[PDB]
Amino acid sequence: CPLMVKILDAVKGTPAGSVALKVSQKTADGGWTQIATGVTDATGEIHNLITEQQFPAGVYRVEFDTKAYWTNQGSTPFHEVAEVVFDAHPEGHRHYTLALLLSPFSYTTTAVVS
């Protein structure tokens, strides 16, 4: 699996479970095609989110529904959504992990690329 996520909750010190997300692929005319959806497990991960065949070189957008997460936690969040947008070059079996650390009024995101 070439695309992994890891979401953490900075208030509770746990992974962020049951966060919905959407993966979209940029098209030649600059629009977006949705190619996958998923919900994190209790470890803040989505196993087998997409296949290598579904992940050619191109720009991708991962939309995390953080507002619903915080609302369900009982906190009022600032952000309507958290989007991560990046150009992927998966040649050579290159894999991407998107890490996201959530607080109600902040988030940190980073990427680990191997």
Add this chain to the structure above:
Amino acid sequence: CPLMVKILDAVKGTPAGSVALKVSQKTADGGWTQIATGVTDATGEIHNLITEQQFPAGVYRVEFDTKAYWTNQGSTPFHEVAEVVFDAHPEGHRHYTLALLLSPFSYTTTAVVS
């Protein structure tokens, strides 16, 4: 000024100068329309980005062109853009500061709401 930004560079320990951004407003039909552009000064700020009259209650998107910033620093960035999306004045009019801390493969966003 009801909407302020503050962008810092975590590689250099300075504000991030000359970062381009675009402000869009969510439309009634669920789309977006661009209402302002700007470029940070050497303190990482944009004075008079929009007026209070341009900033009524509703959802806004600020698109920060972090890829161009890092390219112009001679670094290779991960993200195509950094987007911050939020509902403004949902319980009354306030002032918003969007803070953004940039590294080539990571960013931290937070908001200070008056």
Add this chain to the structure above:
Amino acid sequence: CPLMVKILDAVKGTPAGSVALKVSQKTADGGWTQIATGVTDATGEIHNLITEQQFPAGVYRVEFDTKAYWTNQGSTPFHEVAEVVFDAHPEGHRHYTLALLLSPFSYTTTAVVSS
């Protein structure tokens, strides 16, 4: 002032008010001497934390009492304290802003250094 702090609360989206801190200087023998204490105002800052006379080149430690901040906010925090340790004026005199973004189980710190 040559050493400024800015503390923000990532749960509430406000500055972190009434955070206590201590500034110390590393001694020739490897110990620490306290040179200042302070408590942030409602903007998350401490005006006139130290003077230039108190800030010769060397290693300094700023200890932020984040555990008491969260305990008073009514949250249960992870860290006992948050410490920022840096060599000041290594290549000549500079001014320093230490920014700190607090959550109960996380913090981010960065520095803005200018000539």
Add this chain to the structure above:
Amino acid sequence: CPLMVKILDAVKGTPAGSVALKVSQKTADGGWTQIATGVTDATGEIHNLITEQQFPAGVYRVEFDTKAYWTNQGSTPFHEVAEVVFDAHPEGHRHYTLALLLSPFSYTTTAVVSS
């Protein structure tokens, strides 16, 4: 394995390998006893840093040598060290992961605590 670390490099998008760190345990007299030292592997982790037997309830300090990490990357860093200080098993045994995201002038640190 009750204490794990995970260090990432925010400039390169890789784990931070070969980071030296020290683990100290606070003593009743308010001092610190060093109980372990380690170096991260190429995944930014240290396997078998300490045993459950070495990790009773109490306050611990993990000192990460971030300055040497950046100095060897050829970068110029701000912080002299990054220290993480926390009270362990305050309400019963848990497992602790200390995560650290490094940039030359910033770091973010969070904890994941199991049950």
